[PDB]
Design an enzyme around this catalytic site. Structure first.
Site, short mmCIF file in Angstrom:
data_model
loop_
_atom_site.label_atom_id
_atom_site.label_comp_id
_atom_site.label_asym_id
_atom_site.label_seq_id
_atom_site.Cartn_x
_atom_site.Cartn_y
_atom_site.Cartn_z
N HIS F 201 0.63 -1.26 0.12
CA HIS F 201 0.49 -0.27 0.05
C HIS F 201 0.65 1.36 -0.06
CE1 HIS F 201 -3.38 -2.58 -0.25
NE2 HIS F 201 -3.93 -1.99 1.22
N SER F 205 0.50 0.43 -6.61
CA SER F 205 -0.26 -0.57 -7.86
C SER F 205 0.83 -0.51 -8.81
CB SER F 205 -0.91 -1.25 -7.68
OG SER F 205 -2.04 -1.36 -6.53
N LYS F 227 -15.63 -5.61 -9.64
CA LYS F 227 -13.85 -6.84 -10.28
C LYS F 227 -13.51 -8.31 -9.25
CE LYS F 227 -10.78 -5.94 -13.56
NZ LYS F 227 -9.07 -5.95 -13.35
N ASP F 228 -13.66 -7.69 -8.46
CA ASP F 228 -13.00 -8.84 -7.29
C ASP F 228 -13.42 -9.45 -7.65
OD1 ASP F 228 -9.76 -8.41 -6.76
OD2 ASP F 228 -11.27 -5.50 -6.07
N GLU F 271 2.69 -33.66 -5.76
CA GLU F 271 1.83 -33.34 -6.04
C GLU F 271 2.08 -32.56 -7.53
OE1 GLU F 271 3.30 -32.73 -3.42
OE2 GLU F 271 2.70 -31.57 -2.63
C1 HEM Z 1 -0.28 -15.86 0.06
C2 HEM Z 1 0.28 -15.99 -0.86
C3 HEM Z 1 -0.37 -14.21 -1.31
C4 HEM Z 1 -1.13 -13.19 -0.80
C5 HEM Z 1 -2.69 -13.28 -0.67
C6 HEM Z 1 -0.83 -12.07 -2.36
C7 HEM Z 1 -1.79 -10.44 -1.75
C8 HEM Z 1 -1.49 -9.82 -2.31
C9 HEM Z 1 -2.09 -9.29 -2.85
C10 HEM Z 1 -3.80 -9.07 -2.51
C11 HEM Z 1 -1.78 -8.26 -4.08
C12 HEM Z 1 -2.01 -7.23 -4.58
C13 HEM Z 1 -2.89 -7.52 -6.16
C14 HEM Z 1 -2.57 -7.52 -6.75
O1 HEM Z 1 -1.46 -6.62 -7.17
O2 HEM Z 1 -1.95 -8.83 -7.17
C15 HEM Z 1 -0.55 -8.29 -3.69
C16 HEM Z 1 0.46 -7.79 -4.66
C17 HEM Z 1 1.96 -8.71 -5.21
N1 HEM Z 1 2.47 -9.39 -4.11
FE1 HEM Z 1 1.59 -10.57 -3.54
N2 HEM Z 1 0.17 -12.38 -2.34
C18 HEM Z 1 0.43 -13.52 -2.04
C19 HEM Z 1 2.20 -13.64 -2.52
C20 HEM Z 1 3.14 -13.70 -3.58
C21 HEM Z 1 3.92 -13.66 -3.96
C22 HEM Z 1 4.35 -15.62 -3.71
C23 HEM Z 1 4.49 -12.82 -4.72
C24 HEM Z 1 6.05 -12.77 -5.24
C25 HEM Z 1 7.73 -13.26 -4.44
C26 HEM Z 1 3.54 -11.41 -4.56
C27 HEM Z 1 4.28 -10.65 -4.91
C28 HEM Z 1 3.34 -9.45 -4.57
C29 HEM Z 1 4.16 -8.57 -5.62
C30 HEM Z 1 5.27 -8.40 -6.42
C31 HEM Z 1 3.40 -7.45 -6.06
C32 HEM Z 1 2.60 -6.18 -6.43
C33 HEM Z 1 2.02 -6.21 -8.07
C34 HEM Z 1 0.91 -5.01 -8.12
O3 HEM Z 1 1.26 -4.19 -7.68
O4 HEM Z 1 2.23 -4.35 -9.99
N3 HEM Z 1 3.37 -12.40 -3.65
N4 HEM Z 1 0.08 -9.83 -3.00
#
Ligand code: HEM
Ligand SMILES: CCCCCCCCCCCCCCCCCC(=O)OC[C@H](COP(=O)([O-])OCC(O)COP(=O)([O-])OC[C@@H](COC(=O)CCCCCCCCCCCCCCCCC)OC(=O)CCCCCCCCCCCCCCCCC)OC(=O)CCCCCCCCCCCCCCCCC
Ligand SMILES: CCCCCCCCCCCCCCCCCC(=O)OC[C@H](COP(=O)([O-])OCC(O)COP(=O)([O-])OC[C@@H](COC(=O)CCCCCCCCCCCCCCCCC)OC(=O)CCCCCCCCCCCCCCCCC)OC(=O)CCCCCCCCCCCCCCCCC
Ligand SMILES: COC1=C(OC)C(=O)C(C/C=C(\C)CC/C=C(\C)CC/C=C(\C)CC/C=C(\C)CC/C=C(\C)CC/C=C(\C)CC/C=C(\C)CC/C=C(\C)CC/C=C(\C)CCC=C(C)C)=C(C)C1=O
Ligand SMILES: CCCCCCCCCCCCCCCCCC(=O)OC[C@H](COP(=O)([O-])OCC[N+](C)(C)C)OC(=O)CCCCCCCCCCCCCCCCC
Ligand SMILES: CCCCCCCCCCCCCCCCCC(=O)OC[C@H](COP(=O)(O)OCCN)OC(=O)CCCCCCCCCCCCCCCCC
Ligand SMILES: CCCCCCCCCCCCCCCCCC(=O)OC[C@H](COP(=O)(O)OCCN)OC(=O)CCCCCCCCCCCCCCCCC
Ligand code: HEC
Ligand code: HEM
Ligand code: HEM
Ligand code: HEM
Ligand code: FES
Lengths: 379, 164, 52, 239, 56, 379, 110
Positions: F201, F205, F227-228, F271
């Site tokens: 935050h 983004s 949308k979500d 798996e």
């Molecule tokens: C436990 C699983 C995860 C949850 C619940 C989670 C949750 C979120 C959410 C809700 C967002 C905002 C929506 C989005 O930008 O896609 C986000 C963004 C992001 N997450 Fe995750 N995430 C998870 C796993 C990961 C993993 C595995 C990575 C990579 C190592 C990661 C890296 C990021 C990054 C870089 C963003 C920014 C994306 C952007 O705004 O362009 N997250 N995460």
């Protein structure tokens, strides 16, 4: 360049939390029981986990698994008795914390007080379930009685009993689901405790004098960190006397008996931290009245912020109210002792009188005393 | 506005049905299992128990006592007084065959085990508090709220009684 | 929660929001009987009752 | 080596929203009871599950009391033998795994409560297996006791031919042809593995319909509430 | 228009909106369950236990 | 006097996180998976609790408990298969999330990227223990193989393996501790996901274009929330199709045989969502080299912000690099298939080349190519 | 300063002792329980058995065939070609005591 302590998000949160939080200097020892609670919770979060990895929540192996933990597990008895006596000490600290809140008028912080009441409810449910887990005779029979109490609710009270039971009696499903809920709930306790602290921070802690101490606040990190370290270590002292010298001092010996749904134990009681409510339960002859009194004995804490009529928020300067408060504490201890004893002469009438006196103090004596108090001091 | 809000309303009613019929899945899952129901059905009570003797089971998960009371014990319960107590309820009224009296086992009013078999005031003696249930279960010495409630049954025959 | 809340304007406001609050309670009652599948109401109803 | 995979037979329940022929389940239980139950077991399935699927309550009770199942210690100090009832699982044929291995040539008849959900291929396997018995090919000499089945991994199954033409008499009167017996027993075993097979499919049907309804409207909601951004029509007016 | 009368009647008030949604779900669950069970038994005819109960 | 949305201390964070959060206007559907992960986790928490409602983590009754869930408990099969296919779908969305992060240059956000890597690690460990729990043939044998992989560590190998096992082989102790670890870890994932959102935050983004959208932000509530919700509905569609039309489509049938520590199954494939590393583990002949390659395959995500050299944040405007990224995705699919297949002549060499090329793309090919278009675009 | 920091040092050294003990109790609770290292642990066989006798055992969770391989069997096993064997293990490399060979009773291949 910026200081990482007050610029990094996580470090900023922690810094405002318990590093540079402006806290009153005259905070007495009774506020330490705040942190100690969390500490026990942390320990309670910890040891239970190490119990959960040698517990098979089945009515044919639960007791055998517990004996296995105590006997044939490397330093397992220490973990198990740490868990039990830590529960006892957690409730000791919780009761002292509630007493501190009542005394120094900390319920004036509304949201924190409501969150505390919720924490009390959920932690007591958690402890009840955890005590059901070991599957002793006392465990099973107390579970039967306490769940059967819910039958008093009209119409839909009957249906909840089998739902919670998972069958027609406290059996396999009840034990397994009680293990599951006892595992999950303390994390809910942790979340609610975090929200509790969140709400407390927006107003700051209440000093014993009650009056706002915004001209005397001191940083938390150098002064209170060491004070709560001392408090936690001192608590660990008592906890280790409990576990190491007399572990089963707080607990019915009949629990060390395989639960058998064919022989009620001669002596039936809940744990020492529940006997006080059991006293009001057995005071009211009506079953539904008993359950309502059970709920009200705890929920009456929610009415306390409204009943405060004294112009002082602190009980330091309220002698008559102080005598009333200590009478209330003696009333609670009397309720506990009465719950310990069987329902016979003269315990029955003493229990009725103690219940009436407790409700009467919390609802009527304290506000009337506060009113005559204010009249006595030109306000 | 009606068109847009009608789309919203249809979505909402679909979501409502889905939510109800999923939370009901979870709640019914936490409810009683099928095996428990298939254990709480009619239970097999056989001859076994001889006359004038009380024996116990765990049908439904509760400690049912079936006492085979002698035909002489039927006369002895006939002499058991009725009106002056709380639950007169002659033993004939409770069970069609007083030779085979049956009742759920829990002592109401939080009692230590009443001594079983013939008792000494007629079928029991509840030590914690008065009552001392009769051989038909009724409150024999005391006003204790009510006796041990008798389970319903559809007994197949003599020496064959099924309870449920 | 005292004489402050008692007054002609507060009574009128009560009257103003009584229809809305009352039929909100009706909403809650209908939702409750629906969710619980309360037979003791649903039996008296039309076509719905044919479920049982 | 090689692993002759089972061809995909056109089962009645193969369809996307097609449930098993419950009359075929009724027929397939009898073959299990009179043929497969002699050495195999279905420990995870009790007579209770049978009611409402291929039998009614009184027939289930009679069938259960046909066999004798062990109950707990009597009031004397020992096991007392009693006829079965609704809440008794299908009787084990052999007291323990060791007795099962010794009674046979040395193998173990696997429990069929999951044999269709454990074997790669499912019913098409088992059916073909029961119908895949044949003379071993030249150049292959199986040991005495071993039987040749191409579908079985290793082609050296220790199974006597279980199904031969006119092995048992179906109550309804359908012919006892080996193919019919194998088909019915395979449907029954599939039901045993997946008791929810009917209801699951039924549930799926509803999920197909309402999500065919929710998905557009919700989408219709999104484009409704997102149209403001999709019709912005920006403009730039620098001095 | 029918939609206009609909909106002016029972869609303006959000609480009446909720009442409409709830009473609509009351009958939607019934109708959808009846229709889906109907489709399912029509697809699988002569195979479900209900269709073959009468024999025994 | 002030909107409760922006006045209540608890409501402050919720409003600033989901209601009035400035989000990029041109966010594609690839970001919806961020919600799809979190929502999915809740189902895994919601379902996984109810599995814990009826489950005895004991060698002699774990499989019996699972069968009793899927056969006797009311709609227990629904919960069980919803849980398993939800875990598989969770990994699907996790892979898509990592792919989105790689593509649109989100790894510039550093702290969120590393926290996400930790999230990935924890989720894979959780899934491993979960697959251990049913105590089928594949469960037990895959657990044995994967924990034996730790023996490759020098010196402390055997003692660490015996420590994790809780004994001498995968048995009572291993299953019992795995259940409790599987209970605790998802709550760690939840707290770490809260930390992930907190870190994200602060930097807004990354929109698909890659340029800063600080001047085109839009309120979150009327937008993507709906949308979500639509994305969650599509996710529910896929999950429900999987559960209701082929529950065991993504799962080896051999698991339904009770775990017998005397018969090695014909295949020991884990798996579907782990083979991509497992295949790499098979590729390196050296055991220690195999384990290091396996862990480095996931760890390589941490190096990604360092290896980026193209002066454009996003992959939207880098065609050759896009071809490289899709080659990487094809390599991942190939690795999964190879891990599925046994270790024979045609598959060994294919696995070798797949592993080598998968590492080569991330370490060498992608940055070297990123230099190329920079030189091509006169900068 | 030395006095105050000596108080600090004594406090933290006592805390270090207590902390290692507290965490070592947990880590040892991880370790093999007493029961598992009493049966699955080394089980100690017997050697009074006669030649050519596979003393039927059941330990480690599997059957144990300790057989007194006679001299004829010893030389036959040694003469058996390792190359044609599916297992690339020579007889002498597979056994430490040629006349007492110990194996787990389970076969592979089910
Ligand atoms: C436990 C699983 C995860 C949850 C619940 C989670 C949750 C979120 C959410 C809700 C967002 C905002 C929506 C989005 O930008 O896609 C986000 C963004 C992001 N997450 Fe995750 N995430 C998870 C796993 C990961 C993993 C595995 C990575 C990579 C190592 C990661 C890296 C990021 C990054 C870089 C963003 C920014 C994306 C952007 O705004 O362009 N997250 N995460
Ligand atoms: C003479 C011996 C009899 C007891 C003397 C203490 C007493 O009862 O009242 C004096 C006094 C309590 O009355 P106060 O000074 O008006 O209130 C002090 C506050 O409670 C603020 O207390 P504090 O922060 O200064 O720490 C002391 C506190 C510490 O309390 C705790 O740690 C929790 C309660 C004990 C567990 O305990 C007390 O205040 C009550 C005495 C507890 C032991 C008896 O307590 C002490 O002076 C502590 C004496 C400790 C032993 C020396
Ligand atoms: C005819 C064969 C299919 C269409 C041609 C696909 C192709 O070769 O290139 C995709 C072609 C070129 O990609 P693009 O339009 O630059 O992609 C824009 C967004 O990055 C990706 O698209 P978007 O985020 O602008 O819009 C969402 C889009 C794409 O949604 C997704 O890709 C995520 C949901 C689908 C499952 C994830 C795996 C695919 O959804 C759909 O196209 C259909 C609904 C999919 C499920 C609900 C969402 O785009 C399309 O055909 C539509 C979007 C991709 C559909 C796959
Ligand atoms: C464009 O960015 C964004 C989105 O969608 C693309 C979003 O949906 C959301 C909102 C996402 C969620 C509410 C779900 C994911 C969040 C978590 C898992 C963090 C933990 C908090 C919860 C309320 C979920 C878990 C609750 C309980 C166990 C965010 C923050 C976001 O940034
Ligand atoms: C309280 C509101 C009514 C709840 C209720 O029992 O609804 C009826 C329905 C269906 O049952 P019912 O329609 O037979 O009504 C209740 C009947 N007794 C009292 C005998 C159980 O209740 C439920 O489905 C669950 C009851 C608890 C709900 C909370
Ligand atoms: C400890 C026992 C001694 C004790 O409490 O002595 C009273 C003393 C008074 O302290 P102070 O408020 O400074 O006195 C002002 C006088 N004008 O100290 C106090 O009054 C301080 C303690 C106040 C109450 C703290 C809460 C715990 C009380 C005991 C357990 C109660 C549990 C049940 C109720 C919840
Ligand atoms: C099959 C996998 C792909 C499904 C979606 C189809 C697809 O990739 O469409 C192309 C799309 C183009 O994205 P865009 O940013 O518009 O490209 C600009 C180019 N100048 O490509 C993208 O949007 C790239 C998305 C990458 C991340 C998700 C897909 C990979 C997941 C791997 C795990
Ligand atoms: C009658 C309708 C049936 C069905 C459907 C099956 N059997 Fe048997 N079986 C027997 C023995 C000794 C074995 C062990 C052989 C081995 O596994 O090596 C078996 C094995 C099976 C399997 C396992 C095949 C596989 O893929 O692993 C299956 C699916 C199977 N059986 C089904 C013994 C007997 C009998 C002995 C008298 C009779 C009768 C049956 N089986 C009958 C059936
Ligand atoms: C909120 C803090 C907790 C309290 C107050 C608490 C309380 C208790 C109590 C009183 C018992 C009964 C002890 C006995 O009779 O021997 C118990 C048992 C148990 N608790 Fe907890 N518990 C807590 C947290 C946890 C947690 C987080 C777990 C899981 C990780 C857990 C797992 C167990 C287990 C497995 C048992 C059974 C072992 C035993 O009874 O000895 N507890 N708990
Ligand atoms: C789950 C157990 C609890 C934890 C972990 C917890 C945590 C804390 C902590 C750390 C403090 C600050 C230290 C202090 O002032 O004591 C605090 C303050 C407070 N808590 Fe709690 N608490 C718990 C239970 C309760 C309960 C049961 C109540 C009463 C209903 C309550 C009401 C308060 C109040 C009123 C304060 C403010 C005290 C003051 O201002 O002086 N808490 N809580
Ligand atoms: C991080 C999210 C989670 C993932 C990815 C996950 C994954 C899995 C997987 C793959 C299985 C194996 C299921 C099968 O083979 O049939 C499983 C089983 C299990 N999980 Fe989870 N799980 C998660 C969360 C939870 C939680 C929070 C709990 C406890 C509340 C839980 C309790 C269980 C139980 C009891 C089993 C054994 C029953 C079964 O096999 O389904 N899970 N989990
Ligand atoms: S003690 Fe049994 S009736 Fe009062």
């Amino acid at each position: 360049m910026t200081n990482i302590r007050k610029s990094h998000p996580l470090m900023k949160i922690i810094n405002n939390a318990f590093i540079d939080l402006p806290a009153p200097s005259n905070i007495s020892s009774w506020w330490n029981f705040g942190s100690l609670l969390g500490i026990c919770l942390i320990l309670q979060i910890l040891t239970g986990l190490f119990l959960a990895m040698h517990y098979t929540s089945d009515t044919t192996t639960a007791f055998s698994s517990v004996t296995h933990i105590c006997r044939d597990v490397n330093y397992g008895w220490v973990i198990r008795y740490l868990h039990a006596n830590g529960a006892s000490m957690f409730f000791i600290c919780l009761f002292i914390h509630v007493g501190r809140g009542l005394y120094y008028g900390s319920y004036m912080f509304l949201e924190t007080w409501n969150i505390g009441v919720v924490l009390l409810f959920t932690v007591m449910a958690t402890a009840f379930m955890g005590y059901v887990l070991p599957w002793g005779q006392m465990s099973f029979w107390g579970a039967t009685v306490i769940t059967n109490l819910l039958s008093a609710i009209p119409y839909i009270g009957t249906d909840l009993v089998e739902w919670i039971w998972g069958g027609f009696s406290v059996d396999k499903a009840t034990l397994t689901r009680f293990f599951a809920f006892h595992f999950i709930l303390p994390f809910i306790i942790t979340a609610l405790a975090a929200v509790h602290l969140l709400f407390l921070h927006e107003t700051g802690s209440n000093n014993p004098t009650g009056i706002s101490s915004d001209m005397d606040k001191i940083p938390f990190h150098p002064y209170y960190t060491i004070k709560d370290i001392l408090g936690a270590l001192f608590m660990m002292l008592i906890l280790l006397i409990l576990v190491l010298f007399s572990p089963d001092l707080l607990g019915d010996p009949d629990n060390y008996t395989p639960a058998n749904p064919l022989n009620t134990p001669p002596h039936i009681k809940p744990e020492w931290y529940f006997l006080f409510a059991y006293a009001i339960l057995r005071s009211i002859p009506n079953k539904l009245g008993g359950v309502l009194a059970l709920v009200a004995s705890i929920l009456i804490l929610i009415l306390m912020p409204m009943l405060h009529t004294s112009k002082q928020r602190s009980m330091m300067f309220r002698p008559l109210s102080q005598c009333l408060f200590w009478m209330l504490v003696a009333d609670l201890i009397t309720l506990t002792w009465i719950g310990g004893q069987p329902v016979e002469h003269p315990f029955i009438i003493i229990g009725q009188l103690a219940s009436i006196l407790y409700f009467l103090i919390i609802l009527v004596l304290m506000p009337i005393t506060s009113i005559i108090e204010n009249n006595l001091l030109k306000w | 506005k009606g068109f847009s809000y009608l789309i919203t309303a249809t979505t909402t009613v679909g979501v409502a049905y889905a939510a109800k019929n999923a939370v009901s899945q979870f709640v019914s899952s936490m409810s009683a299992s099928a095996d428990v129901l298939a254990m709480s059905k009619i239970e097999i009570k056989l001859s076994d128990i001889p006359e004038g003797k009380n024996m116990a089971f765990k049908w439904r998960g509760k400690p049912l006592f079936v006492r085979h009371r002698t035909k002489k014990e039927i006369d002895q319960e006939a002499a058991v007084e009725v009106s002056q107590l709380r639950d007169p309820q002659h033993d004939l009224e409770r069970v069609k065959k007083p030779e085979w009296v049956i009742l759920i086992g829990v002592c109401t009013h939080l009692g230590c085990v009443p001594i079983a078999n013939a008792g000494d005031f007629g079928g029991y003696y509840c030590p914690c508090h008065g009552s001392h249930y009769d051989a038909s279960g009724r409150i024999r010495k005391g006003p204790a709220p009510l006796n041990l409630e008798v389970p319903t049954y559809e007994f197949t025959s003599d020496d064959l009684v099924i309870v449920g | 929660m005292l004489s402050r809340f008692l007054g002609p304007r507060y009574r009128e406001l009560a009257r103003n929001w009584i229809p809305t609050a009352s039929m909100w309670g009706a909403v809650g009652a209908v939702g409750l009987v629906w969710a619980t599948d309360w037979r003791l109401i649903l039996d008296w109803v039309p076509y719905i009752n044919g479920k049982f | 080596d090689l692993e002759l995979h089972a061809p995909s037979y056109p089962w009645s329940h193969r369809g996307l929203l097609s449930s098993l022929d419950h009359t075929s389940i009724r027929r397939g239980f009898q073959v299990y009871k009179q043929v497969c139950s002699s050495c195999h077991s279905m420990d995870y399935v009790a007579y209770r599950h049978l009611v409402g699927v291929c039998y009614t309550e009184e027939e289930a009770k009679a069938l259960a009391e046909e066999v004798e199942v062990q109950d707990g210690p009597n009031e004397d100090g020992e096991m007392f033998m009693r006829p079965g009832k609704l809440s008794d699982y299908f009787p084990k044929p052999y007291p323990n795994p060791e007795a099962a291995r010794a009674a046979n040539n040395g193998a173990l008849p696997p429990d069929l409560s999951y044999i269709v959900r454990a074997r790669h291929g499912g019913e098409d396997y088992v059916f073909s297996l029961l119908t895949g018995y044949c003379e071993p090919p030249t150049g292959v000499s199986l040991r005495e006791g071993l039987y040749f089945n191409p579908y079985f991994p290793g082609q050296a199954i220790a199974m006597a031919p279980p199904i031969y033409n006119e092995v048992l008499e179906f109550d309804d009167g359908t012919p006892a042809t080996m193919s019919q017996v194998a088909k019915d027993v395979c449907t029954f075993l599939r039901w045993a593995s997946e008791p929810e097979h009917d209801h699951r499919k039924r549930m799926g049907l509803k999920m197909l319909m309402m999500m065919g309804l929710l998905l557009p409207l919700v989408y219709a909601m999104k484009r409704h509430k997102w149209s403001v951004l999709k019709s912005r029509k920006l403009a730039y007016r620098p001095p | 228009t029918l939609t206009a009368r609909l909106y002016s009647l029972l869609f303006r008030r959000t609480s009446t909106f909720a009442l409409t949604i709830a009473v609509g779900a009351l009958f939607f669950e019934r109708a959808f369950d009846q229709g889906a069970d109907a489709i399912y038994e029509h697809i699988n005819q002569g195979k479900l236990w209900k269709h073959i109960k009468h024999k025994y």
